[PDB]
Design a protein around this ligand. Structure first.
Ligand SMILES: CC(C)C[C@H](N)C(=O)NS(=O)(=O)OC[C@H]1O[C@@H](n2cnc3c(N)ncnc32)[C@H](O)[C@@H]1O
Length: 621
């Protein structure tokens, strides 16, 4: 049932209005007016279909809520989007559509961008990166070269996973075992087998001990630390320190990827090219199954002329992972005029020191031993080279649970179980989509799409809009003399508890709390002030920004970009609890509330949580 008549509000019109206003007013531009910084990052998407499905926005909603909250708390916020556009995902969608990946990728990116704007994510579109732009992959190639010069890239004979169906080698991390114990590509489920071949490898095993140990520095889920620990698989066996991890098969026999900025002489000595080496435009881009890539047939390009000698260019390309290994840095390098600060410049390093590590990164568990391992590896090499200031790229990682289709499988184009976001956004609105996805369950749980809960979410938003109408359009329903201490208390507590839920990324519970508050407004003949509506709107804006802006405007208030997070007075909350003063050797370092009297020895590990560490809690040596 699509909302109409008395069961609808003007969601399409409101959402377009506010999207337009945010663009004109530059609402999401990354500011630099504070010493408080927050880098909230989504895993950027592949343009490997005609558009997003409703699964994609789930994690993007979660980081948007935090980003929006942080702006309201006065932080400068980096929250950017971009296109993971090289390598197999983009190429395979082009090939399977009978299109050339250059124009087709551009065309699909336009659609993705339109979809994202229609959802009201607070991206600064001036920070966009595209891993296929030559100004971007200039740096991908630079990084590879520095990896080489450090001794960490070489061509050697290894046992590769040959994939006849793709015409290429694949890395061990790109292979999975099926129900019958057979090895297939993680993407496409193409059969593979082992074969000795001379191929480019990156020496990830040389970083294995640090990749393992440095997990201790990270606020990452146990499940993810475990996957990486087991993949690295460090074991002493008969005195040899061994690893299940092998060096990273890095070259692909495909057209659509970064060229290796490399040429060879008659003895196969490797030489490096200093400048950007662009992928030549070719029409003959189908993979040959021979062990060489399609670039090998481009005779004129492969013949590298230097000092009257004819050398041979490398004819492989880099994998899709090369651009995603450093894109979190590219966003910091990206400039208003469309250029990138040089990665090794002083200005880059200072900007990195301001923004890194990413404070909150959300993306799927499927990247456990792919991007989330590989990116850590490149980052550490850059750290060793004094290019980046931190040991680790991403401090806090959350893996959003998969949204499943109605078949109960993970939602994906490949399984033909997708729901098109354009239809939900048309029929119900972006605000409903965002609220619904957070309400489906805990962010980290998997969950199944359910039409009737979508419809219930829309009815709820309609209910919010109608309660605002009641109290705003009739001035007699607001009277500062009205006596209802419990409500003034409920209001102050809402601010406190919603704040805590946002901080905890417990967005489903946050919505339940907003629903309870609305139930309470519907019982009130009068309320003391419009302030609780203003505060509700400001806070709801983090999840339902379009309708929240509309409600704020109808209150005669300023737009969200000029607002602050609501403050509460704890002396209006009708129930107080014990405050425990924590000390470091007789000297006060923190105080905090302990809710109830449940535990005592378990609750001394709650005093360790607070960033500055029943009555007193002294810590003597
Ligand atoms: C950093 C780089 C290596 C990322 C890479 N370019 C990439 O993965 N691109 S992407 O388009 O496939 O995915 C984008 C995001 O969307 C999530 N997602 C996908 N399906 C679902 C689903 N059914 N439910 C919830 N989330 C989903 C997915 O995990 C990821 O974080």
């Amino acid at each position: 049932l699509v909302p109409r008549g008395s069961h609808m509000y003007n969601h399409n019109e409101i959402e377009k209005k506010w999207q337009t206003r945010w663009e004109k007013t530059k609402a999401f531009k990354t500011t630099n007016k504070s010493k408080d910084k927050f880098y909230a990052l989504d895993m950027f998407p592949y343009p490997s279909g005609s558009g997003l499905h409703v699964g994609h926005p789930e994690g993007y909603t979660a980081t948007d809520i935090i980003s929006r909250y942080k702006r309201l708390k006065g932080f400068d916020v980096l929250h950017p989007i971009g296109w993971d556009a090289f390598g197999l995902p983009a190429e395979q969608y082009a090939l399977s559509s009978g299109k050339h990946p250059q124009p087709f990728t551009l065309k699909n990116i336009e659609n993705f961008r339109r979809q994202l704007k229609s959802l009201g994510f607070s991206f600064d579109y001036e920070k966009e990166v595209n891993t296929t732009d030559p100004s971007y992959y200039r740096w991908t190639q630079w990084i590879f070269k520095q990896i080489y010069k450090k001794g960490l890239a070489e061509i050697r004979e290894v046992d590769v996973n040959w994939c006849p169906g793709l015409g290429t080698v694949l890395a061990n991390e790109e292979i999975v075992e099926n129900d019958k114990g057979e090895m297939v590509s993680e993407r496409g489920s193409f059969p593979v087998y082992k074969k000795p071949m001379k191929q480019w490898v990156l020496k990830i095993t040389n970083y294995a001990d640090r990749l393992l140990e440095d997990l201790n520095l990270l606020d990452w889920p146990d499940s993810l630390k475990k996957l990486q620990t087991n993949w690295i698989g460090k074991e002493e066996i008969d005195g040899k320190i061994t690893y299940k991890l092998q060096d990273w098969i890095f070259a692909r026999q495909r057209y659509w990827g970064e060229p290796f900025p490399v040429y060879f002489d008659e003895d196969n000595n490797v030489y490096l090219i200093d400048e950007l080496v662009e992928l030549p435009h070719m029409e003959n881009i189908m993979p040959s199954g021979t062990g060489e890539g399609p670039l090998a047939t481009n005779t004129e390009w492969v013949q590298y002329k230097k000092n009257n000698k004819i050398f041979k260019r490398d004819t492989n390309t880099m994998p899709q992972w090369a651009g995603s290994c450093w894109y979190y840095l590219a966003y910091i390098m990206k400039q208003e005029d469309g250029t990138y600060l040089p990665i090794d410049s002083k200005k880059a390093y200072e900007a990195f020191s301001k923004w890194l590590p990413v404070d909150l990164y959300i993306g799927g568990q499927e990247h456990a031993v792919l991007h989330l391992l590989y990116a850590r590896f490149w980052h550490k090499i850059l750290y060793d080279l004094k290019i980046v200031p931190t040991k680790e790229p991403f401090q806090k990682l959350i893996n959003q649970g998969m949204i499943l289709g109605k078949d109960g499988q993970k939602m994906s184009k490949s399984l033909g179980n997708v729901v098109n976001p354009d239809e939900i956004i048309q029929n119900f609105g972006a605000d409903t989509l965002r609220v619904y996805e957070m309400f489906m369950g805990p962010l980290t749980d998997t969950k199944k799409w359910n039409e009737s809960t979508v419809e219930a979410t829309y009815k709820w938003i309609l209910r919010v809009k109608r309660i605002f109408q009641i109290f705003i359009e009739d001035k007699s329903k607001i009277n500062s003399l009205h006596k209802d201490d419990q409500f003034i208390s409920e209001h102050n507590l809402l601010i406190k508890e919603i704040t805590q839920d946002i901080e905890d990324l417990k967005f489903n519970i946050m919505i339940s709390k907003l629903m309870i508050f609305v139930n309470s407004l519907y019982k009130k003949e009068k309320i003391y002030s419009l302030k609780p509506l203003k505060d509700f709107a400001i806070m709801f804006s983090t999840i339902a920004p379009h309708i929240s802006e509309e409600l704020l405007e109808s209150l005669g208030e300023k737009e969200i970009m000029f607002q602050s997070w609501p403050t509460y007075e704890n002396n209006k909350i009708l129930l107080t609890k014990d405050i425990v003063a924590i000390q470091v050797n007789g000297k006060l370092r923190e105080t905090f509330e302990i809710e109830n009297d449940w535990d005592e020895k378990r609750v001394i590990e709650e005093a360790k949580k607070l960033p500055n560490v029943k009555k007193i809690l002294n810590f003597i040596i």
